[PDB]
């Protein structure tokens, strides 16, 4: 009937209505759909999309990453926003007085922020304080640093971490991996 | 059995030319190539070092590397359902500059000149190219050009 130029009845390709059955996450999603619909600020659309995300797409964000973000010139007094878990970091010895709004705080991260003097805030309190996302800075954790992702795209001459259980000599260090034994990859 | 060697079925492709055999004139060696130049590839049958494969005969690529007597050419080769990057190390005998871009640089220079004249005066430059338009109305006269009536001819053997 019609020469279709595209696939028919194709879904969005993106998430909506997060897969979680968390009632409180659903409440946050409901609040931020209201905001993203009736406020025309890009921040709330971004935060709604990020609330839809899965666990591996919401990597933890360390307080060290928070501090490195606040070190940006003019960003010292912005509200740090992490849609995910803010984790502690013992590789830093000072932390500023920032306000961080996050989904979850570890005990260490919350204690570190509070002792530094700033405040740990939930996304609903962040929405109350900054309905349009004014003076905020969104931080995202490192996504392509997982162990699963280092086996992605494995092949000859790719350098991408074979899928292996035991490591050491005589575990795939031989013919096909050195010129002494046949060839190299 | 079947034979697929490096120069398989290149009998006429690498044939030199009619009355153009022998040594290579020196302009091909006096020509210089810089990284980013667009070059057509046409192998010289007389020179057998740095010869392109028969796939790259008639392909146009971009220089990425210049060496003592050679250039490195980037080409997009169609492999399967995608394009792959290929890097050829060819000699200037088989390499030659491309005029496809040079026409475009001439046009961009002309466009800049017209832009400057527009910034001067504002006379509707119309920089953009256009396809051939349908022919406009014209008036053809018959003064000294009265129409000549033609008719189909009868069939005759001619043999």
């Amino acid at each position: 009937g019609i020469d279709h130029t595209s696939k028919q009845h194709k879904r969005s390709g993106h998430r909506t209505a997060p897969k979680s059955d968390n009632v409180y996450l659903k409440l946050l999603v409901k609040l931020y759909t209201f905001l993203a619909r009736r406020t025309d600020a890009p921040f709330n659309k971004v935060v709604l999309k990020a609330l839809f995300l899965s666990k591996i797409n919401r990597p933890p964000v360390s307080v060290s990453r928070i501090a490195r973000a606040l070190k940006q010139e003019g960003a010292a007094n912005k509200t740090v926003v992490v849609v995910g878990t803010v984790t502690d970091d013992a590789r830093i010895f000072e932390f500023p007085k920032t306000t961080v709004a996050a989904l979850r705080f570890t005990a260490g991260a919350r204690a570190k922020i509070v002792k530094a003097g700033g405040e740990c805030i939930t996304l609903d309190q962040l929405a109350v304080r900054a309905p349009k996302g004014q003076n905020t800075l969104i931080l995202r954790g490192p996504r392509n640093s997982r162990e699963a992702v280092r086996h992605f795209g494995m092949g000859p001459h790719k350098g991408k971490a074979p899928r292996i259980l035991s490591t050491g000599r005589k575990f795939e260090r031989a013919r096909g991996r050195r010129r002494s034994k046949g060839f190299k990859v | 059995g079947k034979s697929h060697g490096y120069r398989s079925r290149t009998r006429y492709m690498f044939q030199r030319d009619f009355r153009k055999h022998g040594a290579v004139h020196l302009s091909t060696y006096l020509k210089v190539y810089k990284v980013g130049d667009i070059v057509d590839i046409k192998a010289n049958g007389s020179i057998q070092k740095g010869m392109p494969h028969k796939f790259y005969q008639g392909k146009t690529g971009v220089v990425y590397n210049v060496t003592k007597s050679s250039v490195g050419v980037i080409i997009n080769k169609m492999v399967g359902n995608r394009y792959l990057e290929k890097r050829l190390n060819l000699r200037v005998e088989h390499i030659k500059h491309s005029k496809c871009r040079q026409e475009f640089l001439e046009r961009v220079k002309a466009n800049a000149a017209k832009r400057a004249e527009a910034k001067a005066q504002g006379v509707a430059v119309q920089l953009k190219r256009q396809p051939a338009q349908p022919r406009e109305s014209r008036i053809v006269s018959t003064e000294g050009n009265v129409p000549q009536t033609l008719a189909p001819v009868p069939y005759e053997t001619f043999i």
Binding site: G1, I2, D3 | P131, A132, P134, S137, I139, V140, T142
Partner: protein, 222 residues
């Protein structure tokens, strides 16, 4: 806060002013069409009087209707039909004639009937089967408001403005034609007039360039 009648009256006044602009614009468009037609006739008569021949300007606009179905179409003609937006049988589209356009039409000649449409058939097509593309959605024109809202950046503020831009191929023909959704035509009401369609119009068939007979065909199909 009451907003009972003041804003409504202001909106009515603004709408009346817009209707006035549309009225004068349409009167000017009619004058322009009439003047062009009479000048073509007068130029032909003057050349005939002076002993010359007046050559018609080659037609700048064609209407193309897909005549063949969506089965057993080679890849190049199929892609060209997709690019001309004739993705189904009896689907029609206006096409500004250039060299590139002419080669496109030559490629898909066995699968289309096209020709040089007249003001009457363009106006009838846009009035009856005029649907616009708004947010990738096919909504009927049925109002000057939607055409103004989607093409007022180019000065096209009414359906007759859009019709004028289509017929007298304007600087914004591409945008007006793209805004016009592909015309979904029926089969010709009196039939195709030929026992078999898929021969050229010259050979007693249907496909190819029926230059001015596309008007009769499309008016039957519309």
């Amino acid at each position: 806060a009451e907003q009972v009648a003041a804003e409504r009256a202001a909106r009515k006044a603004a709408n009346k002013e817009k209707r006035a602009i549309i009225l004068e614009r349409n009167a000017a468009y009619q004058k322009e069409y009439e003047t062009a037609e009479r000048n073509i006739i007068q130029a032909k008569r003057d050349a005939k009087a002076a002993g010359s021949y007046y050559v018609e300007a080659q037609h700048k606009l064609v209407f193309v209707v897909r005549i063949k179905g969506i089965n057993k179409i080679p890849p190049k003609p199929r892609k060209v039909l997709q690019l001309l937006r004739l993705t189904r049988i009896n689907s029609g589209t206006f096409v500004k004639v250039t060299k590139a356009t002419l080669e496109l039409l030559k490629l898909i000649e066995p699968y289309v009937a096209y020709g040089y449409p007249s003001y009457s058939t363009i106006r009838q097509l846009v009035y009856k089967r005029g649907f616009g593309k708004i947010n990738k959605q096919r909504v009927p024109l049925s109002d000057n408001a939607i055409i103004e809202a989607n093409l007022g950046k180019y000065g096209i503020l009414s359906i007759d403005d859009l019709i004028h831009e289509i017929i007298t191929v304007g600087p914004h023909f591409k945008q007006a034609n793209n805004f016009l959704w592909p015309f979904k035509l029926s089969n010709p009401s009196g039939g195709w007039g030929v026992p078999r369609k898929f021969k050229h119009f010259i050979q007693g068939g249907s496909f190819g360039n029926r230059e001015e007979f596309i008007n009769k065909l499309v008016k039957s199909m519309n």
